[PDB]
Design a protein around this ligand. Structure first.
Ligand SMILES: O=C1c2cccc3cccc(c23)C(=O)N1CCc1n[nH]c(=S)n1-c1ccccc1
Ligand SMILES: [Mg+2]
Ligand SMILES: [Zn+2]
Length: 322
């Protein structure tokens, strides 16, 4: 039950070359992929080749994976193909600015994870699936969709000529799958709040340590959160357009709850558009600012994400003042 990409799709990606005026600007954290839709698969190829190397994966296998991943994202307002690449980009930028801090296997795994991290998203949250006993909620009682997103990733790997990790040893093959499983489960915001508070307490008391494996998972978790909300780190007008995509997805989920007769949460209620500014202002103070605050403390090169998130909070404060 997986959509296989066509032969022309992946062939055309192999022959794609990134224009030189973009080479410079893909390295910048604030980079917006939005205006280059046709170039997204090739932008993921480029980022892989720059981070891990031109001989990292077999180009033929890699272009099948990417284009099959694209075909298994749905046409929903926010959690879609665009989002996957935007998240992969933010990781690339982070990884590029802290390169030798991570392994080849970790660099390999996290970009692959970011591209697959919302595979086959239906536009619905964990709470919606659990409340109306959806089959996927019966299968995965906690972090529902995220487990499915890992399970979808593993299925693409298992397709014919798609397994980019084939050439790793069976030991490294199961290492990088645990990196991918862990990184994709971390994208559930329900986990972020636990993760961040720990890292701050670890940081402030001086006990945070990167050769400590338990801590690598927590730092990778925060990076995966940092990337998943990177729409709040782009230039003001871009961040405002991505916000509309998000609410459109929340409001469709609202409509489904109103059909069954249940008042949704304000964030998912299209009649409470007035409060949205107070909703963003809250999200930045309670989630986003604290996220990049702790990320920049661990990885000082990731500061531009904190700066852009603050600059957008200012804009959200000006919105409320009229
Ligand atoms: O839920 C998300 C959200 C989830 C996942 C990725 C996101 C990326 C960017 C912005 C948002 C999100 C975002 O803005 N909101 C919440 C915004 C919001 N609108 N109304 C209320 S209330 N809130 C809110 C949610 C959490 C904390 C504070 C406010
Ligand atoms: Mg998700
Ligand atoms: Zn996501």
């Amino acid at each position: 039950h997986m959509s296989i990409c066509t032969s022309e799709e992946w062939q055309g990606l192999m022959q794609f070359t990134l224009p030189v005026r973009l080479c410079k600007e893909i390295e910048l954290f604030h980079f917006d992929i939005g205006p280059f839709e046709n170039m997204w698969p090739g932008i993921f190829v480029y980022m892989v080749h720059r981070s891990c190397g031109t001989s990292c994966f077999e180009l033929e296998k890699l272009c099948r994976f990417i284009m099959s991943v694209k075909k298994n994202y749905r046409r929903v307002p926010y959690h879609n193909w665009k989002h996957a690449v935007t998240v992969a980009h933010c990781m690339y930028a982070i990884l590029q600015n802290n390169h030798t801090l991570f392994t080849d296997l970790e660099r390999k795994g996290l970009l692959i994870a970011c591209l697959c991290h919302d595979l086959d998203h239906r536009g619905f949250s964990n709470s919606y699936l659990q409340k109306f006993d959806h089959p996927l909620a019966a299968l995965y009682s906690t972090s529902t969709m995220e487990q499915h997103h890992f399970s979808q990733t593993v299925s693409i790997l298992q397709l014919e000529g798609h397994n980019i990790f084939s050439t790793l040893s069976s030991s490294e093959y199961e290492q990088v799958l645990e990196i991918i499983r862990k990184a994709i489960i971390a994208t559930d915001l329900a986990l972020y709040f636990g993760n961040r508070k720990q890292l701050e307490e670890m940081y402030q008391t001086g006990s945070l340590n990167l050769n400590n494996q338990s801590h690598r998972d927590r730092v990778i978790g925060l990076m995966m959160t940092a990337c998943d909300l990177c729409s709040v780190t782009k230039l003001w007008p871009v961040t405002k357009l991505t916000a509309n995509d998000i609410y459109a997805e929340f409001w469709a989920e609202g409509d489904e709850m109103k059909k069954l007769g249940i008042q949704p949460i304000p964030m998912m209620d299209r009649d409470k558009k007035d409060e949205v500014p107070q909703g963003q202002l809250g999200f930045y103070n309670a989630v986003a600012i604290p996220c990049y605050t702790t990320l920049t403390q661990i990885l000082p090169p990731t500061e531009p994400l904190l700066k852009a998130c603050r600059d957008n909070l200012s804009q959200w404060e000006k919105v409320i003042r009229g």
